Amino acid sequence: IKQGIREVILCKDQDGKIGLRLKSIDNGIFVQLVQANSPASLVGLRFGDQVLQINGENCAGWSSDKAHKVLKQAFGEKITMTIRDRPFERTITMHKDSTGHVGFIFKNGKITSIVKDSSAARNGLLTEHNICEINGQNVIGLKDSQIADILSTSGTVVTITIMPAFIFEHIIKRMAPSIMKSLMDHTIPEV
């Protein structure tokens, strides 16, 4: 998680889409969905990011509907957004043991127990937290089996980005799990 704010610049695609859904939280605006192969993913927008401004207008207090309406009505050539990086999230680094385990149990992508004497224990990983990313890869909407598979195919060093469950549950509201699984960007970013 980068500390502080960055400016991103966007162009709508030929269809006039940027590939975002936004959600009002605590009088802020946050990214609920980034679509794969979209201007938004291309410029490195991520689930959980806060949008402070769009074309220099503060988003403070805006409804979801208003944020979307503003985006729809913007001239598509250049859209500037001011972004604070995944403010509700933290990243933890763990080392797999000899058996290839980091030391936790999860269910629906939510951590439910920490294993005694594990790397996850030593690093103070918490329960009641949803897994958002693994080694920088968005894993929101994947089956637990796909998440476990990604953990195995990682090196010895595993970084996890987590979010407190209650906040996660609030961000993903008004969205069917089949949309989240199918449409949320899970690609590794392109250079």
PDB file of N, CA, C and O in Angstrom, residues 106 139 141-148 181:
ATOM      1  N   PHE A 106      -9.175 -20.236   5.528  1.00  0.00           N
ATOM      2  CA  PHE A 106     -10.120 -19.247   5.047  1.00  0.00           C
ATOM      3  C   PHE A 106     -11.350 -19.929   4.454  1.00  0.00           C
ATOM      4  O   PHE A 106     -11.351 -21.139   4.241  1.00  0.00           O
ATOM      5  N   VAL A 139      -7.857 -11.173  -6.232  1.00  0.00           N
ATOM      6  CA  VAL A 139      -8.417 -12.517  -6.156  1.00  0.00           C
ATOM      7  C   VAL A 139      -9.861 -12.470  -5.669  1.00  0.00           C
ATOM      8  O   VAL A 139     -10.385 -13.490  -5.227  1.00  0.00           O
ATOM      9  N   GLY A 141     -13.607 -12.757  -5.781  1.00  0.00           N
ATOM     10  CA  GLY A 141     -14.636 -13.430  -6.554  1.00  0.00           C
ATOM     11  C   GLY A 141     -14.224 -14.826  -7.014  1.00  0.00           C
ATOM     12  O   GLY A 141     -15.082 -15.580  -7.469  1.00  0.00           O
ATOM     13  N   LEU A 142     -12.936 -15.168  -6.867  1.00  0.00           N
ATOM     14  CA  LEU A 142     -12.416 -16.493  -7.187  1.00  0.00           C
ATOM     15  C   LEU A 142     -12.883 -17.499  -6.142  1.00  0.00           C
ATOM     16  O   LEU A 142     -13.114 -17.123  -4.991  1.00  0.00           O
ATOM     17  N   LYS A 143     -12.996 -18.770  -6.542  1.00  0.00           N
ATOM     18  CA  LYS A 143     -13.369 -19.814  -5.597  1.00  0.00           C
ATOM     19  C   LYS A 143     -12.187 -20.041  -4.663  1.00  0.00           C
ATOM     20  O   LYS A 143     -11.040 -19.778  -5.050  1.00  0.00           O
ATOM     21  N   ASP A 144     -12.481 -20.579  -3.470  1.00  0.00           N
ATOM     22  CA  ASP A 144     -11.440 -20.826  -2.482  1.00  0.00           C
ATOM     23  C   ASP A 144     -10.374 -21.750  -3.069  1.00  0.00           C
ATOM     24  O   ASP A 144      -9.192 -21.633  -2.731  1.00  0.00           O
ATOM     25  N   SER A 145     -10.795 -22.658  -3.966  1.00  0.00           N
ATOM     26  CA  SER A 145      -9.875 -23.591  -4.608  1.00  0.00           C
ATOM     27  C   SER A 145      -8.879 -22.847  -5.498  1.00  0.00           C
ATOM     28  O   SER A 145      -7.702 -23.200  -5.507  1.00  0.00           O
ATOM     29  N   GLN A 146      -9.338 -21.807  -6.218  1.00  0.00           N
ATOM     30  CA  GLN A 146      -8.457 -21.042  -7.096  1.00  0.00           C
ATOM     31  C   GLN A 146      -7.476 -20.214  -6.272  1.00  0.00           C
ATOM     32  O   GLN A 146      -6.335 -20.022  -6.681  1.00  0.00           O
ATOM     33  N   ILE A 147      -7.934 -19.730  -5.109  1.00  0.00           N
ATOM     34  CA  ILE A 147      -7.109 -18.958  -4.196  1.00  0.00           C
ATOM     35  C   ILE A 147      -6.030 -19.871  -3.621  1.00  0.00           C
ATOM     36  O   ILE A 147      -4.861 -19.496  -3.591  1.00  0.00           O
ATOM     37  N   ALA A 148      -6.413 -21.080  -3.185  1.00  0.00           N
ATOM     38  CA  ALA A 148      -5.442 -22.029  -2.652  1.00  0.00           C
ATOM     39  C   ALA A 148      -4.385 -22.384  -3.701  1.00  0.00           C
ATOM     40  O   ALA A 148      -3.217 -22.530  -3.362  1.00  0.00           O
ATOM     41  N   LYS A 181     -17.151 -12.510  -9.620  1.00  0.00           N
ATOM     42  CA  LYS A 181     -16.278 -13.591 -10.059  1.00  0.00           C
ATOM     43  C   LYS A 181     -15.923 -13.446 -11.546  1.00  0.00           C
ATOM     44  O   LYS A 181     -14.793 -13.715 -11.937  1.00  0.00           O
TER      45      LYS A 181
END
